[PDB]
């Protein structure tokens, strides 16, 4: 019938900081991940409905997509580079979760998932 709301982009209320790692976490992790070919999916919350995949949110309780870490990120939402790692752990965990081995969306996560973690290898300082 509905989705549910987005995840939040802004919070007074949240402690938050510019650091050099979050900064590169968006003009490089975020910005270049978004144009790899298979980012299309990941690239917004779930449409549970225009997907007709009235399960989706039974399943998975805590929603994570690029395009609300993008906002977070451009929102300065984050404390550290940490918080913002999470926040793509969840996204990834969340695709595995709901789907299943050798489902092309999980290809597709796997695929991100490596080049993630070939780009936060190494941060700034
Ligand atoms: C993210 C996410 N996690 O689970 C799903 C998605 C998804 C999200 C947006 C559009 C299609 C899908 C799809 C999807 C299914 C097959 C392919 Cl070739 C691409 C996308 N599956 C459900």
Not at 21 to 31: A, D, F, I, N, S
Not at 48 to 60: F, G, S
Request: glycine letters at 2%; one cysteine or more.
């Amino acid at each position: 019938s509905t989705n549910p709301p987005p995840p939040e982009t802004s919070n007074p209320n949240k402690p938050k900081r510019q650091t050099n790692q979050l900064q590169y976490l968006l003009r490089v992790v975020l910005k270049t991940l978004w144009k790899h070919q298979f980012a299309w999916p990941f690239q917004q919350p779930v449409d549970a409905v225009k997907l007709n995949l009235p399960d989706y949110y039974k399943i998975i309780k805590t929603p994570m997509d690029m395009g609300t870490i993008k906002k977070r990120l451009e929102n300065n939402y984050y404390w550290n580079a940490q918080e913002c790692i999470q926040d793509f752990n969840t996204m990834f965990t969340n695709c595995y979760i709901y789907n299943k081995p050798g489902d092309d969306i999980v290809l597709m996560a796997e695929a991100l998932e490596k080049l993630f973690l070939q780009k936060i290898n190494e941060l700034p300082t």
